[PDB]
Amino acid sequence: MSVFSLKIDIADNKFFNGETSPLFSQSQAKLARQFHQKIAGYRPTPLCALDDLANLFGVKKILVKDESKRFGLNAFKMLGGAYAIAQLLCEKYHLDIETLSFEHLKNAGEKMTFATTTDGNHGRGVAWAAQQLGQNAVIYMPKGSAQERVDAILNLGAECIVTDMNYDDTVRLTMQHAQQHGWEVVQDTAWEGYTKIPTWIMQGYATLADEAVEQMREMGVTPTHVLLQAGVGAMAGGVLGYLVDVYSPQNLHSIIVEPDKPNPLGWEILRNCATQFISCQDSVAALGMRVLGNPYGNDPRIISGESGAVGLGVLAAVHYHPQRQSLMEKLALNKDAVVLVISTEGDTDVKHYREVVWEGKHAVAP
Amino acid sequence: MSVFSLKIDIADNKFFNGETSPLFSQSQAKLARQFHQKIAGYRPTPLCALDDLANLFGVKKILVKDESKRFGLNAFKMLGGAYAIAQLLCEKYHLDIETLSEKMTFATTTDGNHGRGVAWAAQQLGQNAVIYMPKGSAQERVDAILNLGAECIVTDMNYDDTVRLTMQHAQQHGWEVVQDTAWEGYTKIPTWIMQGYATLADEAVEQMREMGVTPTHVLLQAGVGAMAGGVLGYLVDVYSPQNLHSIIVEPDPNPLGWEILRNCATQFISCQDSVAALGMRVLGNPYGNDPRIISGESGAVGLGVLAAVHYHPQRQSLMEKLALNKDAVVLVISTEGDTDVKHYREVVWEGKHAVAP
């Protein structure tokens, strides 16, 4: 079973019209980056070249943006959460984001309470940001949420309520509690009448894309492809929005990867500008985790969680697929392809990570 | 992570008597090392400290001898093969091996590493090698031997029958049989191989003393018994059989090696296939900040046992039985790297021989 077939169903984007989004362009991302540069400990996350994997896979370059090095968060999500939380305080205290002093903000009345529902990473970023800026945070999590993730939030001095409901009901509970107690809801999803905060979050995320382009230009390379994991659409939307502003929608083959098991602002950009959509099996992410965590040849090693590794896992699944030739043609992958991948999270759930990479959970063999 | 139960059948060695070996001690291992040190490109293979894994598993130290770095061969076996072959040439040319620099032909059967070592030695010393491999042998391993200028014949038979054909042809053409196993009337060469292997153990002791540590345990993969007995023979001569908790690991022969094991081993483990698979994955994607080691199926089974014990529901008792605790300094030998690249990546990437289903 070196030759294996995992579900990697490719669909051309029927909604594609190449209309770019001026709200999520270079300029707004560069403003978000200038905020992040002020936080003590800021450093662009590594853009790691998987040369030996690229040679194996039959492409020119594989570049993995390692968002596990994003401060101490082990995930990218603070880029949006902290930026939006900063913009909210600048509104309330009549400050300009361009000239924000954290020290001045600290000695400005009553502490604000930030409320959000999370599966893990987003809420941790809200809790982190509320801990930095001296504010309250109350994070809600649905049932079956990993205790390590509940613990990582509590370690940031914030409350974390595990409910007996799913995500959607827990969002409604967060909204109901926030309306009854006067809290500021900070969700990475948008809906009717809630669009300001999610907009900032998406602009925030584009920081990683702004970094990645600088890093690629430093390398003297031009990306032909990018794989973006879908999640709720915010990261993919924001990052794609930025990348098409830089490269043009026609010169960038963007693949949006949706694992088997949303934000309308992000999805508008994805409908307009995404090249292809892949619907993929659970075991694809798992495969990507292993390839990243035990690299090929002399490639550098990357610790990538379930949500983080799926982009890369698709490339691996294609390479070992019986129909490799036709799949590479469909995705226009070839000896000249320079493929940007984003590893959005590290081993945020250590138990699951080591089950995948050591015990062999979600193995190729079904 | 998850709780699971792989086969790790531990039995105490009831044959234990603590009698050391006159054949496989420090003095022979040091003569073997002095020969190896003379070979162009020699360098003691690394002894890697997996401190963060040791902390996770609840021991003081896990030290892995990484024989994937043994020259360019991705395995340890040349230490025996090359030495024995050098000892054979010094007899034929009446030379002294202690100070050394018609064409013989060496014939052997192999699953991979031993034959490659033999083939390497023949190429280095301007001699001939004819290597026989059984049906189903990995083509990469065949190529590795062919690229050393040797003949590599892949039979349509199993190992035992391929050994017979090696014996038949060797007698026919007057070739010198170089096997890592011993049988009646065939002891001189296997003995040299076992002594040559001890080099790695001599290195490991030098490296541990450089760290200022003393091993409480050693886990040795059983194989044909040549490595285990040769290495254990050296280790018990250094530390005494009493103060060394040796564990011989047999995944699912050699009387010379097995006598030392019967004498000096503390315990034998019979383990499941997936145990070696687990070790390959743990070594190849390390914990915390530990160094990464590339270890093949035969390489990683010692470490795999440690990982299987740690995750077992009966973790506490298994540790008691193996006398593993927060003070345990555990030596593990990674006998080979990724000698079969296809099989390696199937284990580490595809999750072949997964813990569960």
Q: Helix B139-146 and helix B113-124: axis angle, to 10°?
A: 10
Q: Which residues does a chain break follow in chain B (C to N more than 2.5 Å)?
A: 101, 252
Q: Does A360 touch chain B (CB under 8 A)?
A: yes
Of A294, A350, A351, the CB nearest to B284: A294
- A364: which chain B residues are within 8 Å (Cβ-Cβ)? 350-352
Rounded distance between C-alpha atoms, residue B187 and residue A366, angstroms: 48
Strand, coil or helix: B176: strand
Question: Residue B201 forms beta bridges with which residues?
Answer: none
Elucidated via: X-ray
Cβ-in-10-Å burial (0-12, 13-18, 19+) of B178 comes to: buried
* 3-class DSSP state of A330: helix
Q: Give the bridge partners for B12, in sequence order.
A: B267
3 state SS of B141: helix
Contacts of A90 (CB under 8 A, 6+ apart): A96, A97, A100
A119: annotated active-site residue:
yes
Neighbour tally for A38: CB within 10 Å: 13
Test B355 with A365 for CB contact under 8 angstroms: no
| Cα distance between the two ends of chain B | 16
Task: State how far the Cα of A242 lies from the Cα of A264, in Å rounded to an integer.
Answer: 17
- Three-state DSSP at B133 gives strand
Amino acid in position B59: V
**Burial class of residue B182 (count of CB atoms within 10 Å of its CB; 0-12, 13-18, 19+):** buried
Distances (CA, A) of A47 to A28, A50, A76, A302: 22, 10, 14, 11
B69 touches chain A (CB under 8 A): no
Q: Which residues of A49-83 are buried (b: 16+ CB within 10 A; e: fewer)?
A: bbbebbbbbebbbbbbbbbbbbbebbbbbbbbbbb
Tokens of residue B240, six digits: 């005494």
Question: Between B277, B351, B356, which is nearest A364 by CB?
Answer: B351
DSSP for A83-110 reads HHHHHHHHHHHT--GGG--HHHHHT--P
Alpha carbon distances (Å) from B177 to B164, B227, B269, B323: 11, 19, 32, 42
Q: Is B306 helix (H, G, I), strand (E, B) or coil?
A: helix
Contacts of A183 (CB under 8 A, 6+ apart): A113, A114, A115, A138, A177
Question: Long-range contact list for B155-160, CB < 8 A, 24+ apart?
Answer: B158/B134, B159/B109, B159/B111, B159/B134
- Please report, for residues B31, B249, B276, the alpha-carbon distance to residue B270 in angstroms, rounded to integers and kept in the order given: 34, 6, 12
Q: Which two tokens stand for residue A199?
A: 């907009």
State the SS3 of B53-112. HHHHHCCCEEEEEEHHHCCCCCECCHHHHHHHHHHHHHHHCCCCHHHCCCCCEEEEECCC
CA distance B262 to B242: 14
A66 is catalytic: no
Residues of A in contact with B55 (CB under 8 A): none
End-to-end CA distance of chain A: 11
Pairing of strands B329-334, B105-109: unpaired
Distance of CA B48 to the CA centre of its chain: 16
Report the run of H or E that residue B118 belongs to, with start and end. Answer: helix B113-124
Domains and CATH numbers, chain A: 1-75+194-366 (3.40.50.1100), 76-193 (3.40.50.1100)
> Do the beta carbons of residue A121 and residue A129 sit within 8 Å?
no
Q: How far is it, in rounded angstroms, from Cα B176 to Cα B55? A: 49
User: Which two three-digit tokens encode residue A134?
Assistant: 């001296």
Euclidean distance between CA atoms A31 and A25, whole angstroms: 11
The residue type found at B251 is P
Q: In what order do the strands lie in the sheet with A159-162?
A: A159-162, A136-141, A113-117, A184-185
Q: Which residue has the tokens 């969002």?
A: A171
Q: Which residues on adjacent β-strands are paired with residue B332?
A: B64, B219
- Residues ≥6 apart with Cβ < 8 Å to B163: B109, B132, B179
User: B283: which residues sit within 8 A by CB, 6+ positions away?
Assistant: B64, B292, B293, B294, B295, B300, B303, B334
Q: Which residue is catalytic, options B65, B77, B180, B338?
A: B77
B40 touches A: beta carbon within 8 Å: no
Owner of token pair 């040439």: B89
For residue A32, how far is the Cα from the chain centroid? 16
Tokens 């790695």 belong to residue: B200
Q: Which chain A residues are Cβ-neighbours of B342 within 8 angstroms?
A: 2
Resolution in A, one decimal?
2.2
- B residues 244-283 closer than 8 Å to A (CB): 277-278, 281-282
Q: In degrees, to the nearest 5, what angle opens at C-alpha B153 toward C-alphas B147 and B157?
A: 140
Residue in the structure block whose two tokens are 């984001």 = A97
Task: Write the single-letter amino acid at A239.
Answer: V
- CA A306 vs CA A75, A231, A313, A348, A361: distances in Å: 12, 11, 10, 9, 12
For A225, A284, A339, the CA distances from A321, given in Å and listed in that order, are: 20, 12, 19
Beta strands in A222-348 (DSSP E): 225-229, 253-259, 276-280, 338-343
* Nearest in space to B203 (alpha carbons), one of B356, B41, B64: B64
> Shortest CB distance from A361 goes to which of B285, B348, B354?
B354
How many residues are listed for chain B in this entry?
A: 357
Owner of token pair 């508008």? A268
Q: Residue B207 CA to chain centroid, in angstroms?
A: 18
Which chain B residues are within 8 Å of A287, Cβ to Cβ? Answer: 349-350
